[PDB]
């Protein structure tokens, strides 16, 4: 039993007990969120249509906020003297999938 779910314009193949690296959401740690499912597979049984995917709820809980890798941008063009330094971290949020109830 697993679900193709969506969260923040990006999709994940989740299962109960999995830990997913979700785009940062406002809900506080230890609370629970519902991930919108786009597909459910229970083994030789594939729920795909919107009416049935409406009835299924993928519930998960927030664990904490984690940061991505530190990215170092150095925009550069030769023979002009142009440089531009920048950095990025791209915080996300841990999620633990607790249940896929049809």
């Amino acid at each position: 039993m697993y679900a193709i779910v969506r969260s923040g314009g990006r999709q994940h193949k989740v299962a109960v007990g999995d830990v997913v690296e979700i785009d940062k959401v406002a809900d506080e740690a230890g609370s629970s969120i519902e991930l919108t499912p786009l597909l459910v597979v229970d083994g030789e049984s594939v729920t795909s249509d919107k009416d049935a995917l409406g009835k299924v709820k993928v519930t998960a809980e927030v664990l904490g906020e984690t940061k991505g890798p530190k990215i170092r941008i150095l925009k550069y063009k030769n023979k002009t003297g142009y440089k531009k330094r920048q950095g990025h971290r791209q915080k996300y949020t841990q999620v633990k999938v607790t249940g896929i109830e049809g």
């Binding site: 193709i4 597909l39 597979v41 594939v46 795909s48 150095l74 925009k75």
Partner: protein, 119 residues
């Protein structure tokens, strides 16, 4: 107030020599030569972080094409069928299904076949 440059100067040199700590020849030993490669490295990394989207989408599309052609359906017809059926599972999850859960991918192929315009 005479100021000696060395203590402040060495900082960027240490930074660059650390950033260039896998390069071949002078590019990992000499600050000036390491500096030139770090400019190229940064440009390449920026370009490739944006080309990575296309590279992985191409890989997913190839795998989906192979998996659907195994079912007698081309990639374009498969994607049009999914779009008409209204299943918005993306190239990525579809490729993961093709590699891992081939039965679920084949069920999606049947969905696309049924949702074809048949015209």
């Amino acid at each position: 107030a005479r100021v000696k440059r060395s203590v402040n100067a060495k900082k960027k040199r240490r930074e660059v020599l650390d950033q260039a700590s896998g390069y071949r020849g002078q590019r990992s030993r000499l600050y000036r030569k390491a500096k030139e490669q770090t400019l190229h490295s940064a440009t390449y990394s920026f370009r490739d972080r944006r080309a990575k989207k296309g590279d992985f989408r191409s890989l997913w599309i190839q795998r989906i094409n192979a998996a659907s052609r195994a079912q007698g359906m081309t990639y374009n017809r498969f994607i049009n069928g999914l779009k008409n059926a209204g299943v918005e599972v993306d190239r990525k999850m579809l490729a993961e299904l093709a590699v891992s859960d081939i039965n679920a991918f084949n069920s999606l192929v049947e969905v696309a076949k049924a949702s074809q315009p048949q015209n």
